[model samples]
Target: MGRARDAILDALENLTAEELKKFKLKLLSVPLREGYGRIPRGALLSMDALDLTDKLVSFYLETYGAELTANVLRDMGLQEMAGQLQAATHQGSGAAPAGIQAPPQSAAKPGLHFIDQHRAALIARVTNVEWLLDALYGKVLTDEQYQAVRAEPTNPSKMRKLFSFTPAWNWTCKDLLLQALRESQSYLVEDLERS
Candidate 1:
């Protein structure tokens, strides 16, 4: 294995049993991008080295939050990995353009809703449902629970029901779920068009 990967594994080994348990739970909850099969529970201990590294990168960002993960990598002398992690995390989270001014209200055409105009693009952007479920439930869903949510249609009504299924929290998962629905919208729209 390469130096950086070895360093990360060393760090993993050094974590206390309690830490490992927490880390494993968070790691398992990360939704790999579509086309990547689910990393089974305890895969951190069992998966091949390269696969484990990739999953650890995702888990680091999702569980510790981006800033802390970047710091952790930097402190470990993994500067290149730190930079890559920070860049990917911000880019994935839409942080780059966050400070840009919103267009003037007058610039919008009358009665034109933003979501109406950009619906397809929004749908295309939504991915990572497992992560969304983790945010909502403060843990990953069971396979049965995941299938139930995944099986729902992408209409607003069904999306609302999905949101309702989660218990209320001061920090809500509503936005993430909405984004996931938006991502699924084009398929639903296409199905409707066919009918």
Candidate 2:
């Protein structure tokens, strides 16, 4: 994991805004409509209304300044997960299941389902944001400064809506990221609301 992170961080040092935009669009295309509605089987991934709200904000911020690195880190995290989900969905053999979509249940180990059912969308979000940051950072910031902001994803949320974790992992990552953001002395939840 550390190696993957380091490699990505290194790659991030050279991202451009155009590349980021391409990635963001790719993420946006991911089906996001399961568990939230009754649609045709395999029509698309169901949408969770509350899901990806903060993520969208983070991506928007990266279109501008200092907050850009935070967005990139968020992107990196999501893209990794998307890759895994893509594999799982593909490995299922037949077409997507019928209308009665169950959350990923464990075939190998009963009562042990694949965690992070939202993995695909999450990764798409991450990749989307990272591409944007790379493009913006390339035009406006130095590599050193970009890496520093990127590190914020690990520390805590430096900007509101820049990072969050799901209920899985016992919500520890989400809590820590929120606390970190509040500690930054540079972000405001209200500001995020307006922006």
Candidate 3:
């Protein structure tokens, strides 16, 4: 704990505004490149290619830390699921259960454990996004920008435009992330016993 605290303090002390800006840009790029955010061009576009990349970076950074790489967390969940499945086949009976003989659906075959886990993580991530956006731009946005990007609006044009600029890679990243989370949860329930 002390080491963690010292590291955080040291980071705070050493991080210059420029360095902090760079870090935020990296974070913003992660989801965008990975297909997690509102960027429209998809993974093909790089932060260096976008006109508003820096602005997006600034917004996210001012709103959340560079540590907010939720996409990686989703990746981690996928790797974990793969590990669990590997473990499952090795330990369990290879054949279908006695009397019951059907293979599971693709969604259910692996089982719902992973899906449940993914849903929980997705909910949390979305909630975090809400918090970050509200904290960063809630007050900063012009009434018009705020209306445009509000997650829930009577008219969704503004929100749609915001997402249109988001690269497709971000959307892909989000899809995989959620899939991994869901798969992990399902594997835990169907393929393994938990304490």
RMSD per model, one decimal: 16.3, 25.4, 23.6
lDDT of 2 by residue, 54-122 (tens): 333343321221133334444556544433333322334565545756567744534653333333333
What TM-score does each of the candidates earn?
0.27, 0.18, 0.18
Best by TM-score: 1
Tell me the RMSD of model 1 versus the true structure.
Answer: 16.3
Query: What would the per-residue lDDT of candidate 3 be over residues 7-117, giving only the tens digit for each residue?
Result: 223333344645434444454455453444543333314333233334343544422322333233234343343333333324355744356644665333354465345
List candidate 1 stretches off by more than 4 Å.
Answer: 43-195
> Model 2 — TM-score against the truth?
0.18
Positional deviation of residue 22's Cα in model 3 after best superposition, in angstroms: 1.6
lDDT of 1: 0.50
lDDT of the candidates, in the order given? 0.50, 0.37, 0.39
